[PDB]
């Protein structure tokens, strides 16, 4: 029966190789990488009208 219990443990680990903490951290990593992708270098221009 203890073999069955540790089997439940390792099959749970094999079904889900991800901790939710790891999920949240990699989601933050994705958001920061997307922010770096969408980052505009230098000073942006100011929107204004000319007459």
């Amino acid at each position: 029966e203890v073999i069955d219990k540790k089997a439940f443990k390792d099959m749970t680990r094999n079904l889900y190789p991800l901790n939710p903490e790891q999920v949240v951290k990699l989601k933050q990593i994705y958001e920061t990488s997307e922010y770096a992708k969408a980052a505009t270098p230098g000073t942006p221009p100011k929107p204004t009208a000319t007459s």
Partner: protein
């Protein structure tokens, strides 16, 4: 030692059988009349 993994073989498929049973959800239906 050697019986452990083949014990987990069918069980992992059984969970994989179980894991998609909650994914699908049927939508509503609607009927009218007069």
């Amino acid at each position: 030692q050697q019986e452990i993994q083949q014990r987990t073989s069918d069980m992992l498929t059984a969970a994989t059988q179980l894991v998609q049973d909650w994914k699908q959800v049927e939508t509503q239906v609607y009927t009218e009349g007069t």
